[PDB]
Chains A and B, each alone.
Chain A
């Protein structure tokens, strides 16, 4: 169960840098500890800050403003493979950014055998215009959507007396 965290931090002030800059990141992590770890992971690759010489100035858990509204999310990711030369854009339709990232992680692991360590999320954006939207996502956006219920295997109830109807 991932969570979106706003992580704001800065390096500790020094004589060379009396007023260091505050940097903020939106990143998805199961808990605040991993969120701070990923923040230092991204800040370390870019802007010469350790965990030791820096500090987390703010931690916040962001919830979905509209968790009951269906939305389309376009996610840009960096994918590291056995070759490791990859950028991807994928689209997922659901009601929250957290769920879209979770569905992205499951889909990315299923289709490319990519792990949480291999994937870094470039950006998650809400696509509002239908024209801006993946073919499968568009054809879910079809106004006249209707389809039959897919198979769903329907206490212990072994040794049923009658053959199932399954329809």
Chain B
């Protein structure tokens, strides 16, 4: 008899992608070797983000990449941008700067605009040749909580989260508990 808090404690981690994509598994197999044969935190983080799921890999945008790489001091220069996820176009920006992005997927609009205006689009394996240790690479992430679910998570009294309502209007969770004229506001 031993006084141990908990036995056989796996914490939370994913060891392989739940995806059955053959090419994703090929990239994972590459970055398994790269992570464990190099001391690169970059390679380890790329391997972990390849394991991650769709909600944990939000899409990044052309303009967001341009915004992050053009931040006054920055010194982003010609350093390649790396995102483990999809790069979506932003129609609102009318001129796309010369950019270098390595990503799992580029939308057809985003890939066309990047190639038409300046730089190049790379896959994560081609990045593994140019920068096998991830040197001079700007690793970026999408906004995880821009997802609609987080607009509802944590709903409660005085939390200012969106309720799950079937329609929007004056008849739909707007009277009692939502204003002082009907009893209380909560």
A and B touch in the complex (CB under 8 A): no
